[PDB]
């Protein structure tokens, strides 16, 4: 089972450096190349570079002179460094594999990515509050002034999946505010228990709140 | 077979 | 290097119907017989996916509609017929030689039939009254086309400050959008009044949608 995982610092100060751990399993790495693959929000994929199963490493035309990419085969884990980052740099960081052959597995395999805020501003948790009405009946869980993104949510530890939307965050003076919506039928609220969980990693903010009638 | 161990394709 | 050219930036597609997306690279992508060209989904919170290698070979867990073609520098995607799950990111990579490049991208939704908002308004919780914050909130759901406007009133007048809105990405499996619409007011000044109104107008109705409460 071909997997791959980042672990990056989620918030760099402007002008600091950034380093990005892809660690994988499943596949050895003198066998693949290990890619390095950015999206800035809302925007495109930009290739950053990669290493070869040879071990060797190419990079991005423009941005070659700031990244450097390298590996440990005995940890199966390749590296991503930056330097001096800026707000372009802000962005979402995936690692991806391919093998030596061009196939159905080119780039089939990707992590979940890490999200990078350049950014001077305090890590701030979110205060979550539950929102409760004044045949179906909508809830809400509201998660106000946080930063960086991202933050999770689920309703009922996931179990209540259907019925759910979970709108964009939006920053105003330097904090983040989302809100999450589930409908779910009359007959079941109140009579049966209905939880929003947020998690902040950044933070390690972890926090359930039980939705109860006003 | 195509293969790319070092950025470069070749067969 | 070898820049790739995408279009559309977006467009949407009804279902059924066909999309077409077109990749032009600056120079060749073709090298011992075989086109180097990548096609990717990416759906919203998700790594892109594999749809096509070497121009026209479907990659796992990609279903038939999904076909690529083209060789040299023109490239195409098409989707046919399109499905509501087919709302998505799509880009173009080369791969024929280092720098390895990306398409632009292309915003692809699903055209469907107007819907109206179902919209409920939530006072400010408890726990937020506590800490000297009050929000106001507004649900927005299920609705089509995606423009939409949010009116909020105090005591029966507009107030168009303190005002944050956030839409969905399209529903994968209806087709819709929805909006949250946020008023926040310091404690102090929302016990200074009564009536919190948010008036909802969209194409789908003649007059808002209007939910209200008293604090």
Redesign the interface.
């Known amino acids: 089972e071909v997997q791959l995982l980042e672990s990056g610092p989620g918030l760099v100060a402007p002008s600091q450096s950034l380093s990005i751990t892809c660690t994988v399993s499943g596949f050895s790495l003198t066998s693949y190349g290990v890619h390095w693959v950015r999206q800035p929000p809302g925007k495109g994929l930009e290739w950053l570079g990669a290493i070869w199963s040879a071990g060797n490493t190419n990079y991005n035309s423009a941005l070659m002179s700031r990244l450097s990419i390298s590996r440990d085969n005995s940890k199966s884990q390749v590296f991503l460094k930056m330097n001096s980052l800026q707000t372009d740099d802000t962005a979402m960081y995936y690692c991806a594999c391919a093998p030596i052959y061009y196939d159905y597995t080119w780039f089939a395999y990707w992590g979940q990515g890490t999200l990078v805020t350049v950014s001077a501003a305090k890590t701030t948790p979110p205060s979550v509050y539950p929102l409760a009405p004044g045949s179906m009946v909508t809830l809400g869980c509201l998660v106000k002034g946080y930063f960086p993104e991202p933050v999770t949510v689920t309703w009922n530890s996931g179990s209540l999946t259907s019925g759910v939307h979970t709108f964009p965050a939006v920053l105003q003076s330097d904090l983040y505010t989302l809100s999450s919506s589930v409908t779910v039928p009359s007959s079941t609220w109140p009579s049966e228990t209905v939880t929003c969980n947020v998690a902040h990693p950044a933070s390690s903010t972890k926090v359930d709140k039980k939705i109860v009638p006003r | 077979?195509?293969?790319?161990?070092?950025?470069?394709?070749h067969? | 290097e070898i820049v790739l050219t995408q279009s559309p930036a977006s467009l949407a597609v009804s279902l059924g119907q066909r999309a077409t997306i077109s990749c032009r690279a600056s120079e060749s992508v073709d090298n011992y017989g075989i086109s180097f060209m990548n096609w990717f989904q990416q759906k919203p919170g998700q790594p892109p996916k594999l749809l096509i290698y070497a121009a026209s070979n479907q990659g796992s867990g990609v279903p038939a509609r999904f076909s690529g073609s083209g060789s040299g520098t023109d490239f195409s995607l098409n989707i046919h017929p399109m499905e509501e799950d087919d709302t998505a990111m799509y880009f173009c990579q080369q791969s024929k030689e280092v720098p390895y490049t990306f398409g632009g991208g292309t915003k692809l939704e699903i055209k469907r039939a107007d819907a109206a908002p179902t919209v409920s308004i939530f006072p400010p919780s408890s726990e937020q009254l506590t800490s000297g914050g009050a929000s106001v909130v507004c649900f927005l759901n299920n609705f089509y086309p995606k423009d939409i406007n949010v009116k909020w009133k105090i005591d029966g007048s507009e107030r168009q400050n303190g005002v944050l809105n956030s839409w969905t990405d399209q529903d994968s499996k209806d087709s819709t959008y929805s909006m949250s619409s946020t008023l926040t007011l310091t404690k102090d000044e929302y016990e200074r009044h009564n009536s919190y109104t948010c008036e909802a107008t969209h194409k789908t109705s003649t007059s808002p949608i209007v939910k209200s409460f008293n604090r």
């Open positions: 077979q195509l293969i790319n161990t070092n950025g470069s394709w067969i």
